[PDB]
Each structure stands twice: as structure tokens, then as C-alpha cells.
Amino acid sequence: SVPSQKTYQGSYGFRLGFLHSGTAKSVTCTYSPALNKLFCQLAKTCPVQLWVDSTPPPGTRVRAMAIYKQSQHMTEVVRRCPHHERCSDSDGLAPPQHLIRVEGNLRAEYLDDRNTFRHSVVVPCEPPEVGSDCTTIHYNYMCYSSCMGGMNRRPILTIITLEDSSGNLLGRDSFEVRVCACPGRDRRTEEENLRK
Numbered sequence: 001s002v003p004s005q006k007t008y009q010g011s012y013g014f015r016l017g018f019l020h021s022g023t024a025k026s027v028t029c030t031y032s033p034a035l036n037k038l039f040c041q042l043a044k045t046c047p048v049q050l051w052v053d054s055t056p057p058p059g060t061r062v063r064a065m066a067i068y069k070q071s072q073h074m075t076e077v078v079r080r081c082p083h084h085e086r087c088s089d090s091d092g093l094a095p096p097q098h099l100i101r102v103e104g105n106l107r108a109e110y111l112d113d114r115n116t117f118r119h120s121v122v123v124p125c126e127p128p129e130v131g132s133d134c135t136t137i138h139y140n141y142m143c144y145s146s147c148m149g150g151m152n153r154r155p156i157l158t159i160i161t162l163e164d165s166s167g168n169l170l171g172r173d174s175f176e177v178r179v180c181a182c183p184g185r186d187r188r189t190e191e192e193n194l195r196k
């Protein structure tokens with residue numbers, strides 16, 4: 001009824017990482033460690049790093065799913081709003097209803113869960129390129145937090161799960177997301193609010 005959001009490193013030491021993009025007015029994606037919250041513009045690249053302490057088995061996958069953060073909305077499926085689901089911005093692979101897309105990965109698979117109706121996107125877990133210490137997935141969020149008839153100003157969390165080839169849990173991490181026109185200003189505002 002509600003997916004778990006419990007952080008779980010598991011046997012492989014799985015956890016996320018984020019770049020340090022700053023809060024300039026021109027920034028398109030920026031992560032707040034103090035808030036555990038990503039702020040991003042609509043349909044812009046969101047780099048999320050995947051870190052492990054040891055190599056998981058061949059066939060391991062990485063899934064992303066959004067849920068509402070507030071308990072009174074958590075059973076409602078997070079989906080694109082009535083406008084954006086109809087705006088014909090398909091990449092040829094993501095269903096138009098899905099909020100979260102993976103950019104530039106032809107092996108991405110999009111699931112409409114037959115029992116919960118929730119959306120998710122899953123990719124094979126690949127090792128870092130030679131010379132790199134982590135792997136990066138590029139996500140896009142395809143509606144604003146404010147979209148009426150969709151998220152409607154309700155905060156969401158993205159849950160990232162490391163899964164075996166059957167879909168069993170190997171690791172889990174999560175972060176809040178706000179999709180907004182000015183992520184740098186909004187991060188600054190929310191960090192100052194938290195500090196006060």
C-alpha cells in the first residue's frame with residue numbers, strides 16, 4: 001500500500017551521492033544535504049551518484065519511484081498532471097504518465113505495477129567507467145511540484161532501491177524532491193527557514 005523509505009545500505013554498502021552545484025540563480029539542479037532535498041527545474045538532468053563498497057552480482061538493478069511525503073497522501077500514486085500527461089513529450093520509452101524518467105539509457109524499463117498501480121523506472125546496475133569511483137544515473141522529473149491536478153504543491157520523495165534480478169531488496173536510499181522554476185533560490189530559502 002505504501003513503499004518503504006527506510007535507508008538500508010545492505011551487504012554492498014549502497015548509498016547515493018550528489019554533486020555540489022551551488023545555489024546561483026542559473027542553477028538547474030541542486031541538492032541540499034541539510035534538507036536531504038533535491039531542487040530541480042522541469043525536465044532537466046538530475047545526476048544521482050550510486051556508491052557501493054563491494055561489487056553486486058550481475059543482474060543487479062536500480063529502481064526509482066516517487067511517493068508523497070505526507071502520510072495523508074502516501075497511498076495516492078504520484079503521476080504527471082492532466083496537462084503534462086497529454087503534452088506529447090515522449091522520449092519513445094517512458095509512458096507519458098510517469099513523473100520520473102531516466103535519460104540516455106536504452107536499457108531503462110518502465111513499470112506500471114499491476115497491484116499498486118505505482119510507476120517506477122529501473123536500469124541495470126553498471127560498474128563505474130574506468131577512472132571513476134561511482135556510477136551516475138541521469139533522472140528527469142516531468143512535472144512541477146505545483147502542477148494542479150497532479151502533485152498540486154505536495155512534497156514528494158524519490159526512493160532508490162538496489163534490487164537483485166528477481167526484484168528483491170538489496171539496498172535503499174531516498175531524498176525529497178521539489179521541481180520548481182528557480183531551484184537555487186528555493187534551496188536558499190528553505191535552508192534559511194530550517195536554520196531559523
Ligand SMILES: CNCc1ccc2c(c1)c1ccccc1n2CC(F)F
Nearest residue numbers: 050051052055125126127133134135
Ligand atoms: C571505488 N568505486 C566503487 C564503486 C562504486 C559504485 C559502483 C561500483 C563500485 C560497482 C561495481 C560493479 C557494479 C556496479 C558498481 N557500482 C554502482 C552501484 F553503486 F550502483
Ligand SMILES: [Zn+2]
Nearest residue numbers: 081084143147
Ligand atoms: Zn504537470
